[PDB]
């Protein structure tokens, strides 16, 4: 996976072929990408928004804004680095507010109780 | 502007084939820049091609 502002793409390395265009529209500058073994792709925005996508479809299933530590400037609400733990169940992020944040998936969730963002590919953007 | 200036320099001295080779390179390099396609189109239309 590779990303530039508002643009996350997936590439097959065996031949350098474009695999999928993610639904990264309006997410702004992306500072970091991480992929776990469950096909979750995480994109950390410079605007401080955590974007979670399904790697195979490129579907953005969750958007979650980080909260900067007390006394921080609005510009400090920015994700700078990330990595999943070895099991892929914990996401570690380093931010401009000088803190490290640990994220984990909700175990009470299910396909029906937490559907996430709807699959609704925007035809207006010609990235298909 | 550099591409356009180069193409114009080529056309002003009537080197139409150098200009063609250059316009083909321009659209092959930056196919999403409409200005380059319109330049090639207007050049060939001026020559009744």
């Amino acid at each position: 996976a590779s990303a530039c502002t508002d643009d996350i793409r997936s590439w097959g390395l065996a031949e350098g072929s474009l695999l999928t265009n993610f639904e990264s529209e309006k997410t702004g500058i992306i500072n970091t990408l991480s992929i776990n073994q469950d096909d979750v792709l995480f994109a950390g925005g410079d605007n401080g928004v955590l974007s979670f996508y399904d790697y195979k479809s490129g579907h953005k299933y969750q958007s979650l804004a980080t909260r900067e530590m007390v006394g921080s400037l609005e510009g400090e609400r920015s994700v700078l680095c990330s990595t999943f733990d070895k099991t892929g169940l914990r996401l570690i992020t380093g931010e401009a507010d000088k803190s490290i944040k640990i994220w984990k998936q909700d175990e009470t969730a299910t396909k029906e109780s937490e559907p996430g963002l709807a699959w609704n590919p925007n035809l207006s953007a010609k990235r298909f | 502007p550099l591409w356009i200036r180069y193409i114009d320099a080529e056309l002003k001295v009537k080197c139409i084939n150098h200009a063609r080779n250059l316009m083909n390179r321009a659209i092959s390099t930056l196919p999403r820049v409409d200005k380059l396609w319109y330049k090639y189109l207007i050049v060939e239309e001026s020559l009744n091609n």
Binding site: G12, S17, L18, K56 | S28
Partner: peptide, 25 residues
């Protein structure tokens, strides 16, 4: 003829996995 912008092909822009998410890599 096919001499114009020979190196530019529509398929280079199309994401191969959109037609089949489960494509094997």
């Amino acid at each position: 003829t096919d001499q114009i912008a020979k190196n530019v092909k529509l398929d280079d822009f199309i994401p191969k996995r959109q037609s089949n998410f489960e494509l094997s890599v």
